[PDB]
Amino acid sequence: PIVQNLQGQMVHQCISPRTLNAWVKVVEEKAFSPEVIPMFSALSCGATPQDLNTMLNTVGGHQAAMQMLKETINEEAAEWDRLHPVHAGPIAPGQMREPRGSDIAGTTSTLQEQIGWMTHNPPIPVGEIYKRWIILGLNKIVRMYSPTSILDIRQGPKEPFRDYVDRFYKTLRAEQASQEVKNAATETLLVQNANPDCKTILKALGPGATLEEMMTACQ
Amino acid sequence: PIVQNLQGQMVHQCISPRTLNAWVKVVEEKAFSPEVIPMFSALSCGATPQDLNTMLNTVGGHQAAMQMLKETINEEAAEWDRLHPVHAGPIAPGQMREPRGSDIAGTTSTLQEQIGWMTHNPPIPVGEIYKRWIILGLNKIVRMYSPTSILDIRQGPKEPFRDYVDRFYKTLRAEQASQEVKNAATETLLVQNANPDCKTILKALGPGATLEEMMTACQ
Amino acid sequence: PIVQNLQGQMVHQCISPRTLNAWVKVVEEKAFSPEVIPMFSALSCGATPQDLNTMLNTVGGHQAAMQMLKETINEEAAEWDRLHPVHAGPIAPGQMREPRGSDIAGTTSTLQEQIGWMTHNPPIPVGEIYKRWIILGLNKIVRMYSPTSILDIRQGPKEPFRDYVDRFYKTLRAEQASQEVKNAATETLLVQNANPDCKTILKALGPGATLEEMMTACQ
Amino acid sequence: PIVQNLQGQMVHQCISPRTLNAWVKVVEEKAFSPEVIPMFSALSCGATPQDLNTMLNTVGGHQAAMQMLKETINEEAAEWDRLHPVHAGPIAPGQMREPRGSDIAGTTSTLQEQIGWMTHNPPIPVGEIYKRWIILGLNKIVRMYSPTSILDIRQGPKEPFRDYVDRFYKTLRAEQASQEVKNAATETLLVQNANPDCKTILKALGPGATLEEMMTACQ
Amino acid sequence: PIVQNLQGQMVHQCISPRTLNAWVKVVEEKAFSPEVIPMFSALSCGATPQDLNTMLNTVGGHQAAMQMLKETINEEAAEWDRLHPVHAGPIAPGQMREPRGSDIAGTTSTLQEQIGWMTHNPPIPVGEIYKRWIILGLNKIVRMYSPTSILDIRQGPKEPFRDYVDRFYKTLRAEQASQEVKNAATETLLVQNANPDCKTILKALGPGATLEEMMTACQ
Amino acid sequence: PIVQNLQGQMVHQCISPRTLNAWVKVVEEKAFSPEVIPMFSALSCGATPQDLNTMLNTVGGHQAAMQMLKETINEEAAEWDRLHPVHAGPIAPGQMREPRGSDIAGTTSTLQEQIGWMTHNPPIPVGEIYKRWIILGLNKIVRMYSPTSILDIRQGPKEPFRDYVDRFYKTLRAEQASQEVKNAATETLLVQNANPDCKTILKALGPGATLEEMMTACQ
Ligand SMILES: CCOC(=O)CN1C(=O)COc2ccccc21
Ligand SMILES: CCOC(=O)CN1C(=O)COc2ccccc21
Ligand SMILES: CCOC(=O)CN1C(=O)COc2ccccc21
Numbered sequence A, B, C, D, E, F: 001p002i003v004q005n006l007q008g009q010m011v012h013q014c015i016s017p018r019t020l021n022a023w024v025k026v027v028e029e030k031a032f033s034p035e036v037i038p039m040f041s042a043l044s045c046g047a048t049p050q051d052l053n054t055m056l057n058t059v060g061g062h063q064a065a066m067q068m069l070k071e072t073i074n075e076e077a078a079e080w081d082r083l084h085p086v087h088a089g090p091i092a093p094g095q096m097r098e099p100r101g102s103d104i105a106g107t108t109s110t111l112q113e114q115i116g117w118m119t120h121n122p123p124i125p126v127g128e129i130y131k132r133w134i135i136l137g138l139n140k141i142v143r144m145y146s147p148t149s150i151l152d153i154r155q156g157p158k159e160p161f162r163d164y165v166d167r168f169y170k171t172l173r174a175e176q177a178s179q180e181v182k183n184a185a186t187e188t189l190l191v192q193n194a195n196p197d198c199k200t201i202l203k204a205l206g207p208g209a210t211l212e213e214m215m216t217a218c219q
């Protein structure tokens, strides 16, 4: 990554053994559960494109997902090149060349080039551009690997309302419902999918009930 | 987080793998037992709003609780906006814009904006404002998930008085009794709920007995 | 805590994940065995009152003990206020206000106030004052939770003298005998409580025998 | 390794216990699965040739592989010497001598010589030259130890298409197919090797189907 | 401990959680096996007397040994006071007072006094003086707790000579034989205590045989 | 060890708990397998003679090996004294005295003396001299403890050629064959010791076959 030292200048630091192991272990334990994505983003704080490729390449399983991710990255690289074409022909001596899509993705750029860009005044933030493409790709994989439709999450006859609600919002998160839909489902599908006794109590609460209010009512 | 370097200026540092893992593990092991809240506060020392969202988003279960927390955050954001409206229309060039509720909660502000605020002279402490809203939300969840009324904590016939007292104050803490109530319950409900033999001994101690005095008496 | 940086000025540092976990784990494994107290003191090196409250609040069980500790803290705070009353009425602008008992205990003082005091020239050592009150409280709890009188530690008929001595001094430590009593018990109760064969050998050694001498004699 | 200190000059630092243990453990757990190679590269960030030999020499098993690697290293050293012959006869006093192949591989050069080269202006990057030879060697070993031809990866009759795809691309990676072949196999051998029901569905999708499209189709 | 910072002045640093736990765990796993003593010395590198007392006080078992150690410490303190008596009567204002035995042992001196001494030019090395007394005490305990005389270590009839030699020198180390005795026992008691077949072979090797030579002979 | 600080001067640092534990654990798990020696060398990067003795003294078993090592060290110390005799009679005031063999081995020199030597301009590298003697000793122990002659490593009738080759080179490494012998054994004893089917195939490959070529042939 690039960090500020103890005196305030921006320099390269090697990726740590603790960071490398944290990422490999979270993929082993959680696969593509939705909370893996904010973990990746945090573990890659300050990352160069080289570091981002190291993190992805250290994963041993999930090679169908890693091939889908490559396909997303190539699509974003091709849209960058459409928006930001670069001059062909030789580099001005001692000067920096502009990055192409494959330079952002770390496949045709050196570590020194990447440092040059990220520490320019002002920075050309190649690590953050690439991280956004990767996270776009990862969210597609999360949605693909979500096993269950929200239509099929219904409260069991003896199931505590809290446990049902946990299943419901776990599923909405993996299915990638917008926050608007999440805030709205509370007056609709969450009630419809409740068991008969709780459905009666919720029906009588009326409209405008908060989630806290619904949870206390069916406690 | 924002920290002072080894030379004394306030700068951004990436959240550590050890901090990320500590928080995820404490939620896995303890859920919303009351001691999780002081742990969250300590683990988020110096946090930006970005860091606070990372901590909350890295939690994989408990999605009913995370939706209730969002609802609390939105309520506090809306009260901030009532108290501190911001000018509409374009930013003064090179200057800082004032934060709205959703800027405090990290949803409409960038990391650079958050650093600008927190390191202004004097600071606009957006990380500490947001942390207070989150902890307000978390304490509601603790109270909701408390399984047992203090009325139902009574000493068993062969139960050591110390073990009964531990159950009693564990329950008062989750039910969120004020410290006044905790200090007061010692002359009342703690005695009423004791077994017959200990109740007799405590009755005869009189009023004004400390907890230490009651514990020695029923030892 | 407050530490000296790499250049020698006294500044605040966040409490570490390793410190937080060390303390919670030692309470889980050892409860109020006497060696927990020197561990608390060491783990709280350089602590502010805020840090001391964090350590105590992160404990999940033992709520009878934590309520007794609050009672001790309130008693010491009330004696501080008797010895060191503070001026009522408004703060001198930009100047520091004197601490009251509840300011020392971190309940009515801010982190910034606590830093101001501890880094004044010369320091008003609010962290060390509070730590002394806490340790006074903790030693009472250790004595209360000691399960066995020294009168009831007697050597078994086939019990190795070394194992008996370990039981004896483990018990004296929890019962909070002074070092004078510990040094003295060697010529008295340690012999009286020995089994018949070892008691005979120790009787014949005479007075003035060291512990080493008694241990070799009954080996 | 060579690192920049907190003030920005390039200096030697000892290899850490955490780095040493990370590498030995990844070889114990994964052997020569393809993801071990990006792990080696990352763990050896900033390495001298001395450090690279330490990492390889700390491996206890896999001595057939370590002998094959020595053979690769000797071949690259001999090609370096063909391209870059060095002057025979005595060193200019106080000056640096040019590196031979065995100097790059750390067998005939001292640590001080290696530091001299790597920190020259501009650097003679002996650590990175050697690391490239080692990784060339390691990729040969990965290919040798790949147990299964891509021809023999076929979808079972009840095997989820995702699990089949994971097996397919895991195998292509160990067999060292180029990225062109990986991107191309999707319109060919991946379909041919599918079970009858999925093969029918994929045949009807037509040409140009992405991997994501094929995975959804056979879900 | 006292350490040199990153800029070269001698300052106090808090004892670490890793150091505290390392020591408690080595006593739990090894008790007073002889290799515990070099471990204590290393773990207490740079220690103040306060730190040395913390390490000893964090031990929970072995209270017969900790009482014997106190007795040794008191004997060394009393010999220091015989050699280095201190002036009675009031301290010169702002100046340092000379240490007594109980000041060295940390029982009547403050942390600030101990820092003053250890960082004086030239230092009065109170931490190293106390550590020597402690190690004197610890070596007595090791000798006391050694379970077996060297006379009773004899090679079994099918016991590999190497395993016998390991038992022999493990025992000599706990019994605290001088290095002269260890170097000498090789021509004597090591042969006498060997089984009949190996004794014959060793007898015929003659005098002056190294340990390596004896081990190869009976292999 | 001696390290360069963050500002570039050479100073003493205490040996770490992580280094101490790493070494003790590798001896517990691996004993004197050959890969323990490069691990010792790396873990002792920058070591003083004091640190080297700490590492060796913290080992609890293997006391026959530790006595053999002492014997090697004494032999190297005696050859140093033959090559580099020192002046008898008093030290020049404030100046440094020259090291004798037992000063190099840390038995008659202080820590301060060792630092003086290692940080002289130019250094008298007492830590590296001693480490070379120790490693000479350790390699003798590895050879002594090697359980099997290369003559007795022969391929089983159903044993995969790769597994046989791993056994063969594991044994050559412990027996301490030179690299010339290792490179040469491939055209000779490795073939002779192969099973009948593989021996036939290897015989027909001819001379000059690489190890890779032989491994593919018998795959
Ligand atoms: C413009 C092409 O960009 C890449 O293929 C970048 N990349 C790698 O280099 C290696 O690892 C990956 C794994 C998953 C997705 C992408 C990559
Ligand atoms: C004004 C809206 O503020 C949020 O929703 C902030 N927030 C997030 O961004 C993401 O994670 C959360 C989890 C639980 C509660 C709040 C959030
Ligand atoms: C003057 C009142 O001081 C306190 O109650 C300080 N205190 C806390 O704030 C919170 O945690 C505690 C736990 C056990 C004992 C005391 C406290």
Ligand SMILES: CCOC(=O)CN1C(=O)COc2ccccc21
Binding pocket: D053, D056, D057, D066, D067, D069, D070, D071, D073, D074, D077, D101, D102, D105, D106, D107
């Ligand atoms: C020009 C000869 O270069 C080497 O043999 C370097 N080398 C070593 O020194 C020791 O460990 C190795 C293990 C596997 C491959 C190579 C090496």
Ligand SMILES: CCOC(=O)CN1C(=O)COc2ccccc21
Binding pocket: E053, E056, E057, E066, E067, E069, E070, E071, E073, E074, E077, E101, E102, E105, E106, E107
């Ligand atoms: C002159 C008296 O010196 C001590 O008693 C020092 N001391 C302690 O303070 C506390 O812990 C110990 C444990 C074992 C031995 C000695 C001590």
Ligand SMILES: CCOC(=O)CN1C(=O)COc2ccccc21
Binding pocket: F053, F056, F057, F066, F067, F069, F070, F071, F073, F074, F077, F101, F102, F105, F106, F107
């Ligand atoms: C000139 C004599 O040098 C030593 O005996 C150094 N030495 C020690 O001090 C203590 O530990 C050892 C263990 C194994 C071998 C040597 C040592």
